[PDB]
Design a protein around this ligand. Sequence first.
Ligand code: GSH
Ligand code: GSH
Lengths: 231, 221
Amino acid sequence: SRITKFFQEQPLEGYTLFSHRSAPNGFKVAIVLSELGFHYNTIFLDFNLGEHRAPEFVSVNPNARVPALIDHGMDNLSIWESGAILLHLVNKYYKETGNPLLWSDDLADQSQINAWLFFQTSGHAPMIGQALHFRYFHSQKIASAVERYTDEVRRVYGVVEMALAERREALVMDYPVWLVGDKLTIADLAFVPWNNVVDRIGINIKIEFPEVYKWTKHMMRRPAVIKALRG
Amino acid sequence: QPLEGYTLFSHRSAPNGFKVAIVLSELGFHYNTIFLDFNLGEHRAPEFVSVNPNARVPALIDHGMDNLSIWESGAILLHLVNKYYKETGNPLLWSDDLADQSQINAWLFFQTSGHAPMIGQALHFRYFHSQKIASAVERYTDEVRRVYGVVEMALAERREALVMFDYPVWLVGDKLTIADLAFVPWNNVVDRIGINIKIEFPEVYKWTKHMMRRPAVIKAL
Ligand SMILES: N[C@@H](CCC(=O)N[C@@H](CS)C(=O)NCC(=O)O)C(=O)O
Ligand SMILES: N[C@@H](CCC(=O)N[C@@H](CS)C(=O)NCC(=O)O)C(=O)O
């Protein structure tokens, strides 16, 4: 009924974000939404009550998961999957202002940003999710499963660490270093919500991945990011 | 290293590698494939890790673009349809409408983040884990069937609309896109984890059959 009422009379402009109070992927969208200056309203779906089952929500996101975004200005267009939401946001911002904030007007750069974005959504987040699952929520304890996924997460963080280290090495020839085109992009921001969750699986970023540490801290100090995470 | 064309790094049994070959074929781009033997650990060679810092396949080199390196199947697919549309003005396997593109990307990220990884884990605990654990296998097999349930339902609704009947149905804009092709290589392997598409998901069966009959797809595979 709660969510049902919302779809009774939807806003005419702005954005509505469906998420969950402890969903890193939700904050990933909130962050980009905030950085781009997009005004939005967040609805925290109560999965316990099965609000994600509400025919109204499944219609927004057939996968029945969060986040899902409704672009009211575009006839209530619904975009699901955090990766697709980010691309929708930077593409829209760019065509509206002519300024590719957190993005790039260059095909070559966009493909590099996409590579990191797909790497994050497909190789980073899913793995952190599996490690958390076997470490805390599986029907039985499986040490071999925990080790498999925890190792993979450290491995992917090593890929990020190495890339950041190489970017620094190139400049030297504490200054902020970024993954693509020496500028902050959604490729960097996408990791932020999760870099804060990996401690739960025994990973200490500050000590284990120095470069990732500086990188994440630079982003955590940005107003738009602080505002989004406080939401 | 060529001046034009594309060089695709993949593996003989890598569904993600074939996903790229398929799109490269359909779009008419000329490419040559370099198969890596994870035996010798060719994917751990400095020169390859320079192409893909993740040391995984696929990885694509766009020679015409100063040997630009692109890794992650999803990013590779977006690069190809973007480049093709820019060159021809025809959004083959894509769309020139912002709304449509967001839907294509939705399904694309869904396939790469919730489909391929889950099938991958089902296969691992089923065939290659150091220990045999049914609950691990069930967890992923159940998730894969749930994912197909989402596709099946989407295709059924699209079918329902067409009715208001032997015609192909697609995920976005009543036309074949990278959203559809992205599933092809993986649909062909789920039988290894006990999923019978023909029986369990009728619409997916037809959908994958229409795709599997395309000449460009046959050639690539
Ligand atoms: N690949 C998806 C992940 C979607 C996802 O797993 N969302 C989580 C929250 S971080 C969720 O909805 N969890 C509730 C559930 O799985 O029941 C994306 O990036 O949007
Ligand atoms: N999310 C990546 C998946 C990359 C991946 O895991 N590729 C497999 C082949 S399908 C691979 O390189 N396997 C070798 C290994 O894991 O050592 C993509 O879509 O390209």
